[PDB]
């Protein structure tokens, strides 16, 4: 058989647009430096930039592909290059990385977008407020090369976290709960990404 | 004049990666162009003299050190994932124009 | 690795200027080089892939878009005096080094 | 037959030296400028370049051959390209040229070498005061490419002269021709001349 990542990889190196950002990410994201794995500041760029100059039908194609076995999950996983963009020594605390994160114009500007676009409402049939997987979608791949770079974080679903968890918060761990789970547990992002998968 | 050699041209074809005996294990595929036809008219010099020296026997032989069909551009890096989820990255392995060198 | 295309080498003859066919009226001689012998082993990228289709037939033929032996430095200008007293000078005419290209 | 004229061209093309720089002067002494036949600056500097750097053997062979007819003896003529390096549209007095050559170091090095060397005695079995054909010669070919460049002016002889005469001397005519007929009649320096073509 093979999967849907598979035919969305197959999709982007047969255009040229795709197939040029692709490598243009790949390449920084994978090549390491001194005492380190990669540049981040680097490959966040490049990754950016393949969000934001590839069409959508190819970057989300590859992003948001439905999955129905591990080889496939973890292609997926791979796309943003993890090891290089999301991950760290340590997690900081996800209140501490939103206050990174605001700091700069364009995660700022990203993540408003995210908690906007993709706020659920358990009443409408989207499931989302303001009823629109694709400014959703849109709102969530532009994380991507952000200091909020999320990724799949559960093999098993379509969960996704950034690069932060709520340990330490004093007075404020219910509101880094609500920032954090806003990612983990979002029925509206869900069925976003499910609407892609299936061919929308 | 109205170009010497136009049956130097690309060819498109589809492949798998595997197919290309680099030493990679992987699912994914590309487009790989290659360059490929005559180049029997003289473009330079050096290529002039050489088929002058045939025509006028001064080179006992003919097509000897003749020019050919190759890449002049190539085409951009293709990247791939492969079985093991380690990621390569393909460079000058696809021709972009053709030309007689 | 005691190099690939050994074959490909420099062969020089000694000439009259007029033998080139380039137009000239003139007694004067030359020493042209030229570049000959085959480049069957793959130095590059490119030609690997070539090879290789080649070898497991994704490629219907065989030696197609090959590389070939060529000029990859020139020799040093060569000037003469004409019948009619005017001087003249050839550039990129003859070959220093050779290579598979 | 032919002419040890276009012997010494062939000997000369044949040769890595030889042939490098006599390209390299018959170059800018033949690419003509925006009104001028060429750059007089640049071509007298390859000329002195070609004399220097190539061997007595080659670069005498093609300056100093011997003729039987005119269509060596202007092969010869050509050697210095002397229509950018020789002619002038006038004629300046041989003693101001003196001058001019005198304010230059490598013009009045060679000058002085060439009255030195060639200095005629006609006493001697060579004829020449410094009994030394090699360093006339030396000294000879030395003005090529300075503002006292001498060439080959009597297509039926072996003489030669600046490009100057003495008209408008005033007072100093006898010194300028004395000047200018040490290289017009020069005795020594035709003989070094001929000693060179025999074969010495
Ligand atoms: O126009 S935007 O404000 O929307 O910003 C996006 C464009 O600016 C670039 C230009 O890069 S370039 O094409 O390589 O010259 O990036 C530059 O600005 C961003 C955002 O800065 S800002 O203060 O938030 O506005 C910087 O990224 S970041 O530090 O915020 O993460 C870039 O820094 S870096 O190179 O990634 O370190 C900065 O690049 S540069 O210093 O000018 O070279 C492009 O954005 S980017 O490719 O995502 O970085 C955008 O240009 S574009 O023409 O729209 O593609
Ligand atoms: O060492 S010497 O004093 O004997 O002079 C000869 C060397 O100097 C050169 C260097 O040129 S370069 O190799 O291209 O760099 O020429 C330079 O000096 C001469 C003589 O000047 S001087 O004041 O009389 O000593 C200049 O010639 S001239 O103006 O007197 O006719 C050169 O000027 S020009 O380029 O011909 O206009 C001057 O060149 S430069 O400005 O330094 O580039 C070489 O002499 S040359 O090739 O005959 O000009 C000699 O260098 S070498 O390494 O011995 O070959
Ligand atoms: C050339 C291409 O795009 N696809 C080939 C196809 O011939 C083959 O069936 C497939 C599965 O093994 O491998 C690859
Ligand atoms: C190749 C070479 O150096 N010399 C040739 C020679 O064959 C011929 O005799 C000569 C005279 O026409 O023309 C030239």
Not at chain 2, 33 to 48: H, L, N
Request: glycine content about 4%; overall charge positive; charged content about 25%.
């Amino acid at each position: 058989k093979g999967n849907n990542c598979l035919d969305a990889a197959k999709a982007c190196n047969l255009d040229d647009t795709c197939k040029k950002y692709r490598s243009a990410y790949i390449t920084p994201c994978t090549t390491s430096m001194s005492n380190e794995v990669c540049n981040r500041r680097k490959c966040h760029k490049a990754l950016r930039q393949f969000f934001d100059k590839v069409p959508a039908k190819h970057s989300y194609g590859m992003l948001f592909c439905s999955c129905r076995d591990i080889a496939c999950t973890e292609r997926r996983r791979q796309t943003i290059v993890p090891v290089c963009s999301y991950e760290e020594r340590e997690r900081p605390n996800c209140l501490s990385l939103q206050d990174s994160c605001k700091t700069n114009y364009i995660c700022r500007s990203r993540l408003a977008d995210f908690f906007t676009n993709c706020q659920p409402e358990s009443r409408s049939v989207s499931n989302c407020l303001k009823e629109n997987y694709a400014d959703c979608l849109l709102a969530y791949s532009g994380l991507i090369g952000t200091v909020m770079t999320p990724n799949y974080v559960d093999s098993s679903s379509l969960s996704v976290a950034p690069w932060c968890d709520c340990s330490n918060s004093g007075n404020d761990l219910e509101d880094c709960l609500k920032f954090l789970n806003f990612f983990k547990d979002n029925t509206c992002l869900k069925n976003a990404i499910q609407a892609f998968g299936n061919g929308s | 004049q109205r170009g010497k050699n136009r049956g130097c041209v690309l060819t498109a074809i589809h492949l798998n990666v595997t197919d290309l005996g680099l030493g990679y294990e992987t699912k994914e595929e590309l487009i790989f162009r290659y360059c490929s036809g005559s180049c029997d008219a003289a473009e330079t010099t050096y290529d002039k003299i050489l088929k002058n020296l045939s025509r006028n026997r001064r080179l006992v032989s003919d097509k000897v050190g003749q020019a050919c069909c190759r890449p002049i551009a190539f085409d951009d890096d293709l990247s791939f994932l492969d079985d093991n989820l380690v990621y390569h990255i393909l460079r000058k392995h696809s021709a972009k124009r053709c030309g007689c060198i």
